[PDB]
Design a protein around this nucleic acid. Structure first.
Lengths: 49, 93, 107, 95, 33, 86, 87, 98, 107, 93
DNA sequence: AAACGCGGGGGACAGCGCGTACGTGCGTTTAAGCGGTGCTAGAGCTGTCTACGACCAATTGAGCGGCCTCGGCACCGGGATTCTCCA
DNA sequence: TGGAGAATCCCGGTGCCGAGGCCGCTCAATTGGTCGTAGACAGCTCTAGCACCGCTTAAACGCACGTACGCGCTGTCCCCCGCGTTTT
């Protein structure tokens, strides 16, 4: 979920991801918010959607 | 040497206010010690405010703020009146 | 030209033109709006009226028709906002007000 | 004769019924020449500077004795002790 | 509807959008009302 | 050729003066621990003024003491007193 | 309750009794009386108000609506609580 | 061996660590709401510097802590470790507030 | 001519003509005697050294190369003459020196 | 917009005094406040002396008098000497 | 006055009692605060602008220093009063 | 609850120096013209304070309770002052 990749950035972002699926991009709307830049701490997503 | 003495004007206020009672020159010296002391307290405060507004002007609004911040209760508010009112008398005369 | 003071113009006794001369000569600001001397000397006249009342009051309460500094002590310090306002301002030969400590006095 | 203790309070009346100072004056002027001559000598001693500080001294000391008994009676004593005075001057910020 | 004109005649902050959305649903969202 | 220098008139300020002022300050049983516990503390008051006040004198290029610089120092310490001009 | 909320306390009392306990431990209290948590709060707000009234007085003489930390400097210095790191 | 203490014991490490640390001891939304409430009570509708909020808080909680020392000075002076409000008011008295 | 700052003439970092400019700005006197700004910038750099000394002292005493206001509290308030002179100056994020009352310590 | 501050100057006296200790900008701001703070303290005291003796040329003699008065103990006598020191470097230069 | 004593009895002080309080622990939430929005407000920046007392010329009576009292209040004599300590 | 006495307050006679006004004589305080300039005040912009809720969750709060200390009560001894002293 949204805030549980925020608080859990130290574990599930250390393991690698290839295909990520993020749902409901209307909360993804602001780049000033906390959520978007943490997916670069998620560090990899070769396929995205 | 005309040294601006404050016996006569404070004594004019005494003959206005408690005219039955005179004033000892020890007490009159307390008043004469009071005068420019108080005249410079709020004046230094007000020039500080004049640089808080960063102004080379000072109006009666600045003395009004010197009354507004500092004086306890109606001693402010009457001087909010009085300080303006004789200003209102001086803007009338 | 015509030497005529501003104290009658504002209804005061204190020379508001001496206040304006001291105001320009006090360098508080460059432009010295002459109403600021009047806002000064007005509170001067008003508080001199505030204090001479109390001073002659304490005098006549001590059966005196001349204000001595003891009457200034009884004038200022009995007022709660004057003593709150003049917590560190003193009257010479004002003396002390009569007050014994409570458990010091017998009960 | 009498007991320890009794005739204090009318003094606390009379001194505070009155306006004066309660201190020797030739020791006062000699103490002024004493303390002002200690920094720089050769002062020609106006009595104005002599007497100008006694109100600043004695009244504040009188105020200190009230705080002294405030700490003494808060600690429930009237035989006042300097523990009361220095706890006061602590909370006065002197000590 | 008096609250429409009277509370707008008051004109704290951010209330002018908030107060008219409220009173059309309930007056009881306000505690004093 | 006579050097007039005085020292410690604070005992010429008597202990009866404390039995006066402690009553003026509201003390009943002034213990013996008090009377000289007073006489040091006020002396802390005593030099500190004149330490500055003599400091006024020499920049003023003088060899006298006025109460003017007493007022300068007391107001400089926040010990404002009237009866003296101002 | 669930029909209407009504769950407010205060802002002076919004400071919690464990917060008064916290400050009392930083201030040197071993056993706090229960009356301390409110006699503390009273004098806390007593201290609070006198600054900000004159800070708003600055704000009006400086013709503003935003009461500043600059005004807190302007006041606390003059109200004897001079603070470093805010001006 | 359990460690239930008696009324008195646990406090002191906090008295260490608070004074070992350098922070405030207050819920800030009841504090910033206190700032907005009190400052509204003089004149409502301010835009509100939170810099002003902490600029008040630093002088606040320091003065708060400062009073409790003289409170316990009056308490232990009156031979008490349980502080009383009379210690606080006498402390404010000799401090000149009361 | 150019801004060739007057601190280099005095061996200082604080430009003494900015100080002379400030003394002409601060209404302290009509003539600002040109050593009064050097007296000012000199006492200034002396005290800057005074406090940066104890500041780096307390910061590296806390094993940090960054001087923080907590270090400023623990260095300044430990001093007699500084905290005696600055009894009413508060340091935000300075906090307390770590110390407990003696009888509140358990026995 | 180059606006004259004391941040690089407190940095200058820092790396003159504690180059082993960098600064937080909070401590830097505390000192930048403190600079102008005592810069106003001593100079308002000096203008107070310039009105005590009614003078209009405040020299380093007068700042010496202010340093004599205001500062406790060595803080006077050091700023007596140090405040003279660069004075003797600038009266030379 | 100081100053030196000096009964003298109760005030400090010790100390013991007692009982409760106030933390303490821990169960119970809960509002704290964080993000996270959405926006907009007055702050902020400029944009000219003129008026405003500056400043200085003239003047002039202000007001206060030096010059005239005489009287509010202190000083003292005598007595009435009124608080206190031992019956 | 009461008188003896010591302190206080009050009231009558004296007189005086200080409070207050008198008499010039300015000098400062004013009026009279600037004087650009200071802040007067128009526009602009943009930001920065703005609430707000999603939500957590640990802080606050809910309460059992345990005893500590703060006072309840005492005797004392002490201790400091009061009465008497004189000198300084």
């Amino acid at each position: 979920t949204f805030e549980y990749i925020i608080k859990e950035r130290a574990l599930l972002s250390k393991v690698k991801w290839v295909h990520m699926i993020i749902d409901e991009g209307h909360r993804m709307k602001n780049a000033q918010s906390k959520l978007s830049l943490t997916l670069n701490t998620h560090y990899h997503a070769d396929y995205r959607l | 040497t005309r040294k601006e003495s404050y016996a006569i004007y404070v004594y004019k206020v005494l003959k206005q206010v408690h005219p039955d009672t005179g004033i000892s020159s020890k007490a009159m010296s307390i008043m004469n010690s009071f005068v420019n002391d108080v005249f410079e307290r709020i004046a230094g405060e007000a020039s500080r405010l004049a640089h808080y507004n960063k102004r080379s002007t000072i109006t009666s609004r600045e003395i009004q703020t010197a009354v507004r911040l500092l004086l306890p209760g109606e001693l402010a508010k009457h001087a909010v009146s009085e300080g303006t009112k004789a200003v209102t008398k001086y803007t009338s005369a | 030209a015509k030497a005529k003071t501003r104290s009658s113009r504002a209804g005061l006794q204190f020379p508001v033109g001496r206040v304006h001369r001291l105001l320009r000569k006090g360098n508080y600001a460059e432009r010295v709006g002459a109403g600021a001397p009047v806002y000064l000397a007005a509170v001067l006249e008003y508080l001199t009226a505030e204090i001479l009342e109390l001073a002659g009051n304490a005098a006549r309460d001590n059966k005196k028709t001349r204000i001595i500094p003891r009457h200034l002590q009884l004038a200022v310090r009995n007022d709660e906002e004057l003593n709150k306002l003049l917590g560190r301002v003193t009257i010479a030969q004002g003396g002390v007000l009569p007050n014994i400590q409570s458990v010091l006095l017998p009960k | 004769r009498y007991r320890p203790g009794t005739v204090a309070l009318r003094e606390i009346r009379r001194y505070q019924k009155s306006t004066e100072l309660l201190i020797r004056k030739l020791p006062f002027q000699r103490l002024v020449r004493e303390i002002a001559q200690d920094f720089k000598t050769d002062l020609r001693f106006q009595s104005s500077a002599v007497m100008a500080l006694q109100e600043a001294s004695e009244a504040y000391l009188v105020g200190l004795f009230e705080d002294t008994n405030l700490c003494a009676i808060h600690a429930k004593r009237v035989t006042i002790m300097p523990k009361d005075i220095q706890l006061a001057r602590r909370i006065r910020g002197e000590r | 509807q008096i609250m429409y004109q009277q509370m707008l005649k008051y004109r704290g902050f951010n209330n002018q959008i908030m107060q008219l959305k409220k009173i059309c649903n309930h007056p009881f969202v306000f505690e004093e009302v | 050729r006579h050097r007039k220098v005085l020292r410690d008139n604070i005992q010429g300020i008597t202990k009866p003066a404390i039995r006066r002022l402690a009553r003026r300050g509201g003390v009943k049983r002034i213990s013996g621990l008090i009377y000289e516990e007073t006489r040091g503390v006020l002396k802390v008051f005593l030099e500190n003024v004149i330490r500055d006040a003599v400091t006024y004198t020499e920049h003023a290029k003088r060899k006298t003491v006025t109460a003017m610089d007493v007022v300068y120092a007391l107001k400089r310490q926040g010990r404002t007193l009237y009866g003296f001009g101002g």
